[model samples]
Target: AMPKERVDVLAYKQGLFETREQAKRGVMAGLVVNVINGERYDKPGEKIDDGTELKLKGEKLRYVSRGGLKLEKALAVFNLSVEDMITIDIGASTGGFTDVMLQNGAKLVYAVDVGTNQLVWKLRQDDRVRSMEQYNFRYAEPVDFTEGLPSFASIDVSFISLNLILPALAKILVDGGQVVALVKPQFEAGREQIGNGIVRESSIHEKVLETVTAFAVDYGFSVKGLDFSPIQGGHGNIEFLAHLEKTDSPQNDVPTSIKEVVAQAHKEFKKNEEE
Candidate 1:
């Protein structure tokens, strides 16, 4: 018997992914499979030989966390680029958005998360990532970023509404910075409107986007753009992505119609479930 390696490690070594962690996500998500038999391979740690052929099916995930896919769409749809920009990822979690920032040529990324030790090891070791663990970003101030002031920020928080995070971010980002925040309706909508902690109504998603974007506008951020997340959040709740720019005054030049976005989201998820 020859020496064997974990499938994810092999996938990473073969250039299928930037890190083993990303490969693991692919495997667990049922995107990685055996080419010889077309089997659904789920274990990233399953040992296999070096010469084994595997196929990475489905859309390729570019970040360490699936959350990166969310930001990836926002960047493209919002026509915003991160090249050479100093940025921050609030609610960093496993550093998905952080990974996307680095990939897109961001100068530095402050990966801020309320929990400790949740970031992937690859992002942890990267000098570009400033892991701010166990810190409540709701209280962050400008002076806290001693290394570099962020010109851009990405938000993907849970449990708390965007209302709380937007104010703190305004204080931290530079005078004319920008943010691409994930607007999760489950957390923003009234508890009575959410069933079993999952918000399935398009009406609720529309209401949350309008309310949060209005709140951001009130906080001196220009609503630059809006779109639906490419993926669903926890318990299959549809989420929206909003683009905001901190400027001298608010600008409502962007479209705010959540009906099309919400309807498309339901259609996409429903199609996926049926397939």
Candidate 2:
């Protein structure tokens, strides 16, 4: 009998993911597959032959964390740029958003997170990155950033509402600064709407986007663009990205309606699941 190991462990050892937790997420997201037999492994605990050659399908694990792909999509779809701009990444986690910002020619990035020691070494060593670990963005102020106020910001947080974050961000951001926020329905929707930490209904998704975007407008931001993430969020929840600009005269003229984006998200994810 050949030795067997858990699928997630093998995935980590194979360098398919940067960490075991991420490997587990990848497996649960149905990205892990047995190269020999073409079997998709969705359970992290499933035992597989130690020698089995496994491969990941779907989007390549390109960033330190899969979260980078979300920011990548936002930049392209929204026609936003961070080049040569001082930036901040809220909920930096494994530094995925920071990585994308750096790759896109950001002059500097303040990677802020409430937790400690989660940023990968690559970003921690980069001179352009200031790892602001153990700091909450909700209470952030311009004085705290010794380097400079950010001209661009990306928000990807969990368990908390953007309502708390956007206000603080508005205070710290430079005038005319741009933002690309990840609007997670799981966090934005009311408790009754989110079943088991996932918001499945498109109606609820539409409501979340509408409310958040309106809230952004109320904070003196022009809602420039809106779109769904290229991939589903944790636990298969659909998420959105909103492009905003801080200006005195706000123009909440998002090209597409929230209804259309929600419908498109449902259609895209359903197609992916069927394949």
Candidate 3:
């Protein structure tokens, strides 16, 4: 009748949380629990059946939305600091990244998104966040941002390839500019390769990273580091986080084998997703 995920999946989807770890954190803390049996489904790896009823009993998050949690993981994992820095949030849908940047003492944030009126009102009212909505980043030029080029960019775009964004970003972001893009495999991999819209194959994950990372290097963005997103994407698709610098810089060599990274990612995914 209706589409539904496992109890774990349903909890995350309903809460709009990206990672099960955070979901589990809320569950164990009594903020969230199983309502039907009054039992606590506290394990992050626990399988939530089709109709597991979850209950949120404690205070909600402090940001505009769940996006704050995702960016918080990235910023901390990547050891990045936006304090007093010009940062650009690509696909700033509800200003999650913008909120985190502001909370972290960012100097300014160009909240760029292709849609309009989607940003949270609180962030829209902040002077540090500049709304640049309805702007197709692919065709954007440097002069479009009068405030100046951003030193860091975080990409969370959908239904598009990284290939289209890198070229435009290279032109706008200063050299040595760093970026963290949320790699959703469904957008990156071919249709025939995914499993029921989710990317289950390690091969496909490897291929996606290899192709995209090389494409970045070719476009002048050098791959610097790699990590798993603290949260799974929609449909339990394991997402990736890649740190890249403007490729033209001669600091380090191109990225290593994607197979290795994919292998590690799969290993960790299985380990974490189950245990």
What TM-score, computed on C-alpha atoms, does each candidate reach?
0.80, 0.83, 0.76
Give a tens-digit lDDT track for model 1, residues 1-275. Answer: 75798988876664455466877987888877665466767899999876555555764565665568889999899988889989999998877799999999998999999997788778888988889999999999878898889999999998899899988998999888989999989899998889857788778877877788789988889988888888767555778888899987987655556677778788987897677
Q: Give me the candidate number with maximum lDDT.
A: 2
Task: Write down the lDDT of every candidate, Cα atoms only.
Answer: 0.82, 0.86, 0.75
Question: After superposition, which runs of candidate 1 have C-alpha atoms over 4 Å from their true positions?
Answer: 1-57
**Residues 54-110 of candidate 2: C-alpha lDDT, one tens digit per residue:** 667754545666668889999999888899999999999878899999999999999
Model 3, 1-275: lDDT tens per residue? 43445554556665434466666565556555554345656555555554444545532344665556667878887898888889899999877778888898888999999997788777888988889999899997999888889999999887788889989999999988889888878889887887746888888887888878888887888887776675566766777888888856533243565667677777876786475
Q: What TM-score would candidate 3 get against the native?
A: 0.76
Give the Å error, residue 250, model 3: 6.0
Which pairs clash inside model 1? none
Ranking under TM-score, best-scoring first? Answer: 2, 1, 3
